[PDB]
Design an enzyme around this catalytic site. Sequence first.
Site, PDB file in Angstrom:
ATOM      1  N   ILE A  44      38.043  37.777  46.469  1.00 33.87           N
ATOM      2  CA  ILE A  44      37.460  38.370  45.267  1.00 33.87           C
ATOM      3  C   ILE A  44      37.958  37.647  44.026  1.00 33.87           C
ATOM      4  CG2 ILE A  44      37.053  40.448  43.973  1.00 33.87           C
ATOM      5  CD1 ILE A  44      38.695  41.899  46.303  1.00 33.87           C
TER       6      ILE A  44
ATOM      7  N   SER B 186      41.126  34.728  42.250  1.00 37.96           N
ATOM      8  CA  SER B 186      42.140  33.661  42.337  1.00 37.96           C
ATOM      9  C   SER B 186      43.070  33.739  41.124  1.00 37.96           C
ATOM     10  CB  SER B 186      41.467  32.277  42.354  1.00 37.96           C
TER      11      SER B 186
ATOM     12  N   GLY C 223      47.141  31.915  39.194  1.00 36.18           N
ATOM     13  CA  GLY C 223      48.517  31.464  39.385  1.00 36.18           C
ATOM     14  C   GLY C 223      49.396  32.693  39.676  1.00 36.18           C
ATOM     15  N   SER C 224      50.231  32.623  40.706  1.00 34.92           N
ATOM     16  CA  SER C 224      49.919  31.907  41.918  1.00 34.92           C
ATOM     17  C   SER C 224      49.615  33.082  42.840  1.00 34.92           C
ATOM     18  CB  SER C 224      51.116  31.074  42.385  1.00 34.92           C
TER      19      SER C 224
ATOM     20  N   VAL D 156      43.352  37.734  45.636  1.00 35.53           N
ATOM     21  CA  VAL D 156      42.988  38.946  46.333  1.00 35.53           C
ATOM     22  C   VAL D 156      41.849  38.651  47.313  1.00 35.53           C
ATOM     23  CG1 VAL D 156      42.335  41.354  46.124  1.00 35.53           C
ATOM     24  CG2 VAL D 156      43.716  40.251  44.340  1.00 35.53           C
TER      25      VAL D 156
ATOM     26  N   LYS E 205      46.398  41.589  48.113  1.00 35.00           N
ATOM     27  CA  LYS E 205      46.837  40.654  47.085  1.00 35.00           C
ATOM     28  C   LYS E 205      47.948  39.862  47.718  1.00 35.00           C
ATOM     29  CE  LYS E 205      49.081  40.840  42.449  1.00 35.00           C
ATOM     30  NZ  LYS E 205      49.118  41.715  41.234  1.00 35.00           N
TER      31      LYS E 205
ATOM     32  N   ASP F  14      49.230  47.612  27.425  1.00 35.34           N
ATOM     33  CA  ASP F  14      48.185  46.622  27.409  1.00 35.34           C
ATOM     34  C   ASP F  14      46.980  47.063  28.221  1.00 35.34           C
ATOM     35  OD1 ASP F  14      47.603  44.188  26.058  1.00 35.34           O
ATOM     36  OD2 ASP F  14      47.495  43.204  28.009  1.00 35.34           O
TER      37      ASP F  14
HETATM   38  C1  LIG Z   1      34.421  44.041  46.405  1.00 34.89           C
HETATM   39  O1  LIG Z   1      35.685  44.387  45.825  1.00 34.89           O
HETATM   40  C2  LIG Z   1      35.749  44.144  44.478  1.00 34.89           C
HETATM   41  C3  LIG Z   1      34.690  43.501  43.840  1.00 34.89           C
HETATM   42  C4  LIG Z   1      34.787  43.256  42.478  1.00 34.89           C
HETATM   43  N1  LIG Z   1      33.756  42.638  41.790  1.00 34.89           N
HETATM   44  C5  LIG Z   1      32.439  42.393  42.423  1.00 34.89           C
HETATM   45  C6  LIG Z   1      31.936  41.005  41.960  1.00 34.89           C
HETATM   46  C7  LIG Z   1      31.799  40.870  40.429  1.00 34.89           C
HETATM   47  O2  LIG Z   1      30.413  41.052  40.078  1.00 34.89           O
HETATM   48  C8  LIG Z   1      32.660  41.908  39.675  1.00 34.89           C
HETATM   49  C9  LIG Z   1      33.991  42.240  40.381  1.00 34.89           C
HETATM   50  C10 LIG Z   1      35.902  43.654  41.750  1.00 34.89           C
HETATM   51  C11 LIG Z   1      36.952  44.279  42.388  1.00 34.89           C
HETATM   52  C12 LIG Z   1      36.898  44.532  43.756  1.00 34.89           C
HETATM   53  N2  LIG Z   1      37.928  45.156  44.394  1.00 34.89           N
HETATM   54  C13 LIG Z   1      39.256  45.039  44.114  1.00 34.89           C
HETATM   55  C14 LIG Z   1      39.778  44.128  43.200  1.00 34.89           C
HETATM   56  C15 LIG Z   1      41.161  44.061  42.982  1.00 34.89           C
HETATM   57  N3  LIG Z   1      41.714  43.211  42.094  1.00 34.89           N
HETATM   58  C16 LIG Z   1      41.082  42.128  41.616  1.00 34.89           C
HETATM   59  C17 LIG Z   1      40.260  41.402  42.465  1.00 34.89           C
HETATM   60  C18 LIG Z   1      39.602  40.276  41.975  1.00 34.89           C
HETATM   61  C19 LIG Z   1      39.766  39.845  40.657  1.00 34.89           C
HETATM   62  C20 LIG Z   1      40.598  40.556  39.812  1.00 34.89           C
HETATM   63  C21 LIG Z   1      41.253  41.693  40.293  1.00 34.89           C
HETATM   64  S1  LIG Z   1      42.245  42.544  39.131  1.00 34.89           S
HETATM   65  O3  LIG Z   1      43.371  43.252  39.837  1.00 34.89           O
HETATM   66  O4  LIG Z   1      42.696  41.562  38.097  1.00 34.89           O
HETATM   67  C22 LIG Z   1      41.204  43.735  38.264  1.00 34.89           C
HETATM   68  C23 LIG Z   1      40.171  43.001  37.402  1.00 34.89           C
HETATM   69  C24 LIG Z   1      40.537  44.589  39.303  1.00 34.89           C
HETATM   70  C25 LIG Z   1      41.997  44.925  43.671  1.00 34.89           C
HETATM   71  C26 LIG Z   1      43.310  45.115  43.661  1.00 34.89           C
HETATM   72  C27 LIG Z   1      43.571  46.088  44.539  1.00 34.89           C
HETATM   73  N4  LIG Z   1      42.434  46.538  45.086  1.00 34.89           N
HETATM   74  C28 LIG Z   1      41.440  45.827  44.574  1.00 34.89           C
HETATM   75  N5  LIG Z   1      40.112  45.856  44.775  1.00 34.89           N
END
Ligand SMILES: COc1cc(N2CCC(O)CC2)ccc1Nc1cc(Nc2ccccc2S(=O)(=O)C(C)C)c2cc[nH]c2n1
Length: 253
Positions: free
Chosen positions: A17, A19, A21-22, A25, A39, A133
């Site tokens: 989902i 990427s 540093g470093s 997920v 993660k 934040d």
């Molecule tokens: C399919 O699962 C997911 C999909 C998405 N997206 C679907 C694609 C896009 O259009 C928008 C984001 C966004 C989050 C999730 N699920 C997540 C993401 C997570 N974190 C995450 C994943 C990718 C990018 C950023 C993060 S983050 O922790 O910085 C925050 C923005 C959620 C976490 C952390 C613990 N459980 C989590 N579950």
Amino acid sequence: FQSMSVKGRIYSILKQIGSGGSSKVFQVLNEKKQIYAIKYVNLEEADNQTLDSYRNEIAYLNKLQQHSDKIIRLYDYEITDQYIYMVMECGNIDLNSWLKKKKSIDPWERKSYWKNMLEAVHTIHQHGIVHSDLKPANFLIVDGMLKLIDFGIAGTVNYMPPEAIKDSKISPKSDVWSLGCILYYMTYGKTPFQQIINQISKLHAIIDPNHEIEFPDIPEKDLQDVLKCCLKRDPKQRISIPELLAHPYVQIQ
Ligand SMILES: COc1cc(N2CCC(O)CC2)ccc1Nc1cc(Nc2ccccc2S(=O)(=O)C(C)C)c2cc[nH]c2n1
């Protein structure tokens, strides 16, 4: 198309989902074919201060598990000197993506997400943590429900309270300002200073009282009051999480 083991248990990697540093997920399946986010943090070039910061956030996520389902679930983790693996609840989407891709919001759906934001932050505040934040990206939608993923221990400036800009100076009230900014986005489709092109002019705007913040007439006079209350520039004049919890807005529909 490849695997991972966390505390003796194997997980299949559906996809990545996110990427960084470093750290990364992946969306993964366990042997019961249940779905998780894992993660992974690479500690190769991580310094003792960094490492302790991470150990601290992991400690608190683990503790606050028990205390509220409005905090993201941590089911397990494996930590060595080279890496962390955290086995967490998988979100459907983060709030910010969700708002970015929404053209308006259901008044009820909004009210219900507010209740959630308040419950998560109320919690960490009860344990002495001030996130300081808060953004939409700090929240996850899981099965209709908003969950807080992070505690601030381990746009940008939009949700920043003015006491962070003049900065000795940080209180649970700073979080209320930032929540204030989120609701405002969810009510008016933008944060309070998003008009202000220039990022220094913004910063003066955020701290300057000769700058009336605008609150256009809307059907929900309560929502208007809540916003008026969270966005008071003086933290002492600003409203508290426990007061917000007894406000007509979250209590009557
Ligand atoms: C399919 O699962 C997911 C999909 C998405 N997206 C679907 C694609 C896009 O259009 C928008 C984001 C966004 C989050 C999730 N699920 C997540 C993401 C997570 N974190 C995450 C994943 C990718 C990018 C950023 C993060 S983050 O922790 O910085 C925050 C923005 C959620 C976490 C952390 C613990 N459980 C989590 N579950």
